[PDB]
Symmetry: C2
Subunit: 130 residues, 2 copies
C-alpha cells in the first residue's frame, strides 16, 4: 500500500531555508523535456534543469563528431549508456564504451566522436557555477 | 593517437592557467567506492569535492529505505528498471528513461518492483 501521485505535476517538498513546504518539479517522466537541441551531429535533451544543475541525454548521430567545445565555469559529467566513442579532453583522447564515465573540468575543451553506424547515447550532468 | 584511461589526464587549471594532472576517466570495472546492503549495491565511479557519479542497484523486490539528504542534491536517471520513488511525502511510479532529483533538505525512498535488478545512474552535488 502506497497511493501514487501525478508525475506531470509538481511535488510538495521542504525548503531548508523556510522550513516550509514548497511546490517544485523534481520528476521528469516519459517524454517530457525542458529543452531540445539538434544539429548535423547531435541531439540534446535537457530533462532536469535548475539554477544549480541540469541533466539529460546527448545523442551522437551515426559516425558523427560532436565538435570540440569549450566549457566555461561549469563542469560536465558524462556516462556512456550505449555506444563506442573517442573522447578528447584538452589535447589527449581515449577510447570509451558502454559503461564508462568522464567529466570535463571547468575551463577546458572536449570532443566526442561516434565510432558506430548506430546512435550513441550518453547521460550528462551539467554543474552550473555562477 | 590514443591515451591510457587508467592514468590521469593532463588538463588546464582555470586558476593557474597551466596543465595539471587530474583523474577524469573511469572506464571498465574501475570504481573508487563500493557499498552493499540487503537491498542495495552502490558504485561510485567519479568522485571529487564538488560532485560524485555512479550506479545505484536495487536488488530484486527490495526497498532502499528512507534516507535524508542534508545539504546535498542527488540527481537520478533510471537506466533499466521499474520503481516507486518517494520524495518527502509523495510517491511516484518511474521506469527506464525517467529522471528525478532529491532537493537539499528532504527525504527519499526507492522500491524495486521487478524480480530483477533495477539500475539507476546518480550524481551527488556536494554542498
Amino acid at each position: 500500500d502506497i497511493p501514487l501521485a501525478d508525475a506531470s505535476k509538481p511535488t510538495s517538498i521542504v525548503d531548508p531555508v523556510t522550513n516550509q513546504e514548497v511546490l517544485l518539479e523534481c520528476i521528469n517522466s516519459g517524454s517530457s523535456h525542458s529543452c531540445f537541441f539538434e544539429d548535423e551531429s547531435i541531439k540534446v535533451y535537457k530533462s532536469l534543469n535548475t539554477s544549480d544543475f541540469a541533466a539529460g541525454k546527448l545523442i551522437l548521430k551515426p559516425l558523427k563528431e560532436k565538435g570540440h567545445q569549450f566549457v566555461h565555469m561549469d563542469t560536465i559529467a558524462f556516462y556512456v549508456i550505449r555506444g563506442q566513442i573517442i573522447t578528447t579532453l584538452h589535447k589527449t583522447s581515449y577510447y570509451l564504451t558502454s559503461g564508462d564515465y568522464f567529466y570535463v573540468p571547468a575551463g577546458n575543451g572536449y570532443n566526442i566522436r561516434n565510432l558506430l553506424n548506430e546512435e550513441s547515447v550518453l547521460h550528462f550532468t551539467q554543474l552550473k557555477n555562477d
